[PDB]
Short mmCIF file of all heavy atoms in Angstrom, two decimals:
data_model
loop_
_atom_site.label_atom_id
_atom_site.label_comp_id
_atom_site.label_asym_id
_atom_site.label_seq_id
_atom_site.Cartn_x
_atom_site.Cartn_y
_atom_site.Cartn_z
N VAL A 1 10.26 1.40 12.67
CA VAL A 1 10.48 2.74 12.17
C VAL A 1 9.20 3.01 11.37
O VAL A 1 8.72 2.18 10.61
CB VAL A 1 11.66 2.67 11.18
CG1 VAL A 1 11.98 4.06 10.76
CG2 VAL A 1 12.98 2.12 11.88
N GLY A 2 8.61 4.13 11.62
CA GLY A 2 7.30 4.42 10.93
C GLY A 2 6.21 3.62 11.53
O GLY A 2 6.10 3.57 12.73
N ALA A 3 5.30 3.21 10.66
CA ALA A 3 4.17 2.46 11.14
C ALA A 3 3.71 1.41 10.08
O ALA A 3 3.80 1.63 8.92
CB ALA A 3 3.07 3.46 11.38
N UNK A 4 3.09 0.41 10.65
CA UNK A 4 2.56 -0.61 9.87
C UNK A 4 3.70 -1.32 9.14
O UNK A 4 4.68 -1.70 9.66
CB UNK A 4 1.85 -1.60 10.65
N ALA A 5 3.42 -1.63 7.79
CA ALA A 5 4.48 -2.24 6.99
C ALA A 5 4.23 -1.96 5.53
O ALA A 5 3.08 -2.34 5.16
CB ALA A 5 4.54 -3.78 7.15
N UNK A 6 5.22 -1.36 4.88
CA UNK A 6 4.93 -1.06 3.42
C UNK A 6 5.14 0.43 3.14
O UNK A 6 5.73 1.13 3.84
CB UNK A 6 5.92 -1.84 2.51
N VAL A 7 4.33 0.90 2.33
CA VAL A 7 4.26 2.23 1.70
C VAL A 7 3.03 2.40 0.90
O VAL A 7 2.91 2.13 -0.14
CB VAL A 7 5.58 2.58 0.99
CG1 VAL A 7 5.77 1.54 -0.17
CG2 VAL A 7 5.52 3.99 0.50
N UNK A 8 1.93 2.85 1.67
CA UNK A 8 0.64 3.22 1.15
C UNK A 8 -0.43 2.28 1.67
O UNK A 8 -0.44 1.93 2.98
CB UNK A 8 0.21 4.61 1.21
N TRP A 9 -1.35 1.84 0.93
CA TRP A 9 -2.53 0.99 1.30
C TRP A 9 -3.01 0.28 0.13
O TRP A 9 -3.57 0.67 -0.88
CB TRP A 9 -3.60 1.82 1.90
CG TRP A 9 -4.57 1.01 2.77
CD1 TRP A 9 -4.60 -0.32 3.00
CD2 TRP A 9 -5.70 1.56 3.44
NE1 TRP A 9 -5.65 -0.67 3.78
CE2 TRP A 9 -6.36 0.50 4.16
CE3 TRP A 9 -6.16 2.90 3.62
CZ2 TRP A 9 -7.46 0.77 4.89
CZ3 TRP A 9 -7.23 3.15 4.42
CH2 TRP A 9 -7.87 2.03 4.97
N UNK A 10 -2.73 -1.10 0.13
CA UNK A 10 -3.09 -2.06 -0.81
C UNK A 10 -1.95 -2.67 -1.62
O UNK A 10 -0.95 -3.07 -1.10
CB UNK A 10 -3.80 -3.20 -0.25
N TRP A 11 -2.06 -2.64 -3.01
CA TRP A 11 -1.02 -3.11 -3.88
C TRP A 11 -1.29 -2.67 -5.27
O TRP A 11 -2.17 -3.27 -5.91
CB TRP A 11 -1.01 -4.66 -3.78
CG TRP A 11 0.26 -5.13 -4.31
CD1 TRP A 11 1.42 -4.56 -4.76
CD2 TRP A 11 0.61 -6.66 -4.54
NE1 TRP A 11 2.44 -5.35 -5.08
CE2 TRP A 11 1.91 -6.61 -5.04
CE3 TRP A 11 -0.06 -7.82 -4.29
CZ2 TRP A 11 2.59 -7.87 -5.32
CZ3 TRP A 11 0.50 -8.89 -4.57
CH2 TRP A 11 1.90 -8.96 -5.02
N UNK A 12 -0.57 -1.63 -5.77
CA UNK A 12 -0.71 -1.13 -7.07
C UNK A 12 -1.21 0.28 -7.09
O UNK A 12 -0.69 1.17 -6.36
CB UNK A 12 0.59 -1.25 -7.79
N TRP A 13 -2.17 0.54 -7.91
CA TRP A 13 -2.65 1.86 -8.15
C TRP A 13 -4.10 1.85 -8.83
O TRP A 13 -4.16 1.45 -9.93
CB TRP A 13 -1.79 2.59 -9.11
CG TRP A 13 -2.17 3.96 -9.65
CD1 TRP A 13 -2.32 4.31 -10.90
CD2 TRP A 13 -2.60 5.08 -8.81
NE1 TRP A 13 -2.79 5.72 -10.96
CE2 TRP A 13 -2.98 6.12 -9.68
CE3 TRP A 13 -2.67 5.39 -7.42
CZ2 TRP A 13 -3.37 7.31 -9.29
CZ3 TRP A 13 -3.06 6.49 -7.00
CH2 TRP A 13 -3.49 7.55 -7.90
N UNK A 14 -5.18 2.21 -8.06
CA UNK A 14 -6.48 2.29 -8.49
C UNK A 14 -7.28 1.15 -8.00
O UNK A 14 -7.40 0.98 -6.79
CB UNK A 14 -7.10 3.63 -8.10
N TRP A 15 -8.10 0.49 -8.97
CA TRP A 15 -9.04 -0.46 -8.53
C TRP A 15 -9.27 -1.41 -9.86
O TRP A 15 -10.09 -1.12 -10.54
CB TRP A 15 -10.36 0.10 -8.17
CG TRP A 15 -11.30 -0.78 -7.51
CD1 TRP A 15 -12.32 -1.44 -8.20
CD2 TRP A 15 -11.24 -1.21 -6.15
NE1 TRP A 15 -12.96 -2.33 -7.23
CE2 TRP A 15 -12.30 -2.19 -5.99
CE3 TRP A 15 -10.58 -0.98 -4.95
CZ2 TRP A 15 -12.66 -2.81 -4.71
CZ3 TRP A 15 -10.82 -1.63 -3.92
CH2 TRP A 15 -11.93 -2.50 -3.77
N UNK A 16 -8.20 -2.23 -10.08
CA UNK A 16 -8.03 -3.02 -11.27
C UNK A 16 -8.26 -4.45 -11.04
O UNK A 16 -7.41 -4.99 -10.07
N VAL B 1 -9.77 -0.07 -13.23
CA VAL B 1 -8.98 1.11 -13.57
C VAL B 1 -7.62 0.95 -12.82
O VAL B 1 -7.55 0.55 -11.69
CB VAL B 1 -9.55 2.47 -13.12
CG1 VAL B 1 -9.63 2.69 -11.57
CG2 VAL B 1 -8.78 3.62 -13.61
N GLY B 2 -6.62 1.09 -13.67
CA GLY B 2 -5.25 0.79 -12.97
C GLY B 2 -4.93 -0.60 -12.75
O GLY B 2 -5.43 -1.45 -13.62
N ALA B 3 -4.13 -0.91 -11.76
CA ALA B 3 -3.53 -2.14 -11.58
C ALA B 3 -3.56 -2.51 -10.11
O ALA B 3 -3.20 -1.66 -9.21
CB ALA B 3 -2.10 -2.15 -12.13
N UNK B 4 -4.01 -3.72 -9.77
CA UNK B 4 -4.00 -4.14 -8.46
C UNK B 4 -5.21 -3.39 -7.85
O UNK B 4 -6.30 -3.36 -8.30
CB UNK B 4 -4.37 -5.70 -8.40
N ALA B 5 -4.98 -2.80 -6.59
CA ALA B 5 -6.00 -2.04 -5.90
C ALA B 5 -5.29 -1.21 -4.88
O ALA B 5 -4.46 -1.60 -4.10
CB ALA B 5 -7.00 -2.98 -5.21
N UNK B 6 -5.76 0.00 -4.74
CA UNK B 6 -5.38 0.87 -3.67
C UNK B 6 -4.11 1.80 -4.16
O UNK B 6 -4.31 2.28 -5.24
CB UNK B 6 -6.41 1.85 -3.39
N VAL B 7 -3.13 1.91 -3.41
CA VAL B 7 -1.96 2.81 -3.73
C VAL B 7 -0.78 2.36 -2.97
O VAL B 7 -0.69 2.24 -1.78
CB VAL B 7 -2.29 4.24 -3.45
CG1 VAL B 7 -2.71 4.43 -1.95
CG2 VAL B 7 -1.17 5.23 -3.81
N UNK B 8 0.25 1.87 -3.75
CA UNK B 8 1.49 1.53 -3.19
C UNK B 8 1.55 0.02 -2.89
O UNK B 8 1.22 -0.77 -3.70
CB UNK B 8 2.70 1.87 -4.25
N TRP B 9 1.90 -0.29 -1.56
CA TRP B 9 2.06 -1.58 -1.05
C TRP B 9 2.06 -1.75 0.32
O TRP B 9 2.81 -1.17 1.14
CB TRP B 9 3.35 -2.24 -1.58
CG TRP B 9 3.42 -3.73 -1.40
CD1 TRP B 9 2.38 -4.65 -1.43
CD2 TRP B 9 4.75 -4.38 -1.18
NE1 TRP B 9 3.02 -5.96 -1.11
CE2 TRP B 9 4.27 -5.86 -1.09
CE3 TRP B 9 5.97 -4.00 -1.11
CZ2 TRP B 9 5.21 -6.77 -0.83
CZ3 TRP B 9 6.94 -5.10 -0.84
CH2 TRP B 9 6.60 -6.42 -0.80
N UNK B 10 0.99 -2.51 0.80
CA UNK B 10 0.87 -3.03 2.24
C UNK B 10 0.07 -2.01 2.95
O UNK B 10 -1.11 -1.86 2.54
CB UNK B 10 0.33 -4.39 2.23
N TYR B 11 0.40 -1.60 4.13
CA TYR B 11 -0.40 -0.77 4.90
C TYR B 11 0.40 0.01 5.87
O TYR B 11 0.96 -0.46 6.91
CB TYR B 11 -1.62 -1.35 5.64
CG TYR B 11 -2.41 -0.41 6.59
CD1 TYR B 11 -3.34 0.55 6.06
CD2 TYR B 11 -2.27 -0.57 7.97
CE1 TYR B 11 -4.03 1.26 6.98
CE2 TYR B 11 -3.12 0.12 8.87
CZ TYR B 11 -3.96 1.05 8.39
OH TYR B 11 -4.61 1.83 9.35
N UNK B 12 0.62 1.29 5.52
CA UNK B 12 1.29 2.16 6.42
C UNK B 12 2.57 2.79 5.74
O UNK B 12 2.44 3.21 4.52
CB UNK B 12 0.42 3.37 6.95
N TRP B 13 3.65 2.99 6.44
CA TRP B 13 4.72 3.65 5.88
C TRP B 13 5.94 3.37 6.85
O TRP B 13 6.05 3.93 7.94
CB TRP B 13 4.54 5.18 5.92
CG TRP B 13 5.58 5.95 5.13
CD1 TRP B 13 6.80 6.33 5.53
CD2 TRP B 13 5.39 6.54 3.79
NE1 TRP B 13 7.36 7.09 4.56
CE2 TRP B 13 6.64 7.22 3.55
CE3 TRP B 13 4.38 6.52 2.85
CZ2 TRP B 13 6.79 7.80 2.25
CZ3 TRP B 13 4.53 7.18 1.73
CH2 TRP B 13 5.79 7.90 1.41
N UNK B 14 6.78 2.44 6.46
CA UNK B 14 7.95 1.85 7.40
C UNK B 14 7.75 0.44 7.69
O UNK B 14 7.24 -0.46 6.84
CB UNK B 14 9.30 2.07 6.62
N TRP B 15 8.17 0.08 8.82
CA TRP B 15 8.05 -1.24 9.44
C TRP B 15 8.00 -1.16 10.94
O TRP B 15 9.10 -0.90 11.59
CB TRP B 15 9.21 -2.17 8.88
CG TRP B 15 8.93 -3.54 9.03
CD1 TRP B 15 8.68 -4.35 7.94
CD2 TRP B 15 8.81 -4.38 10.22
NE1 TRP B 15 8.46 -5.64 8.40
CE2 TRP B 15 8.50 -5.68 9.79
CE3 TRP B 15 8.90 -4.18 11.70
CZ2 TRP B 15 8.34 -6.75 10.60
CZ3 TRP B 15 8.76 -5.30 12.43
CH2 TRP B 15 8.46 -6.63 11.94
N UNK B 16 6.83 -1.07 11.46
CA UNK B 16 6.76 -0.71 12.94
C UNK B 16 6.54 -1.92 13.78
O UNK B 16 6.88 -1.67 15.18
#
């Protein structure tokens, strides 16, 4: 269902 | 900046 796996790209928010 | 890196989790949207 949909594509790839997950929701978004990476893990979190920003570049921390 | 922020937490982790990128946006959300994993890569894509769903489970293809």
Side-chain angles (χ1 to χ4, degrees):
Chain A
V1 186
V7 53
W9 195 359
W11 197 6
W13 175 234
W15 192 264
Chain B
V1 62
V7 58
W9 191 35
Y11 171 77
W13 194 281
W15 199 109

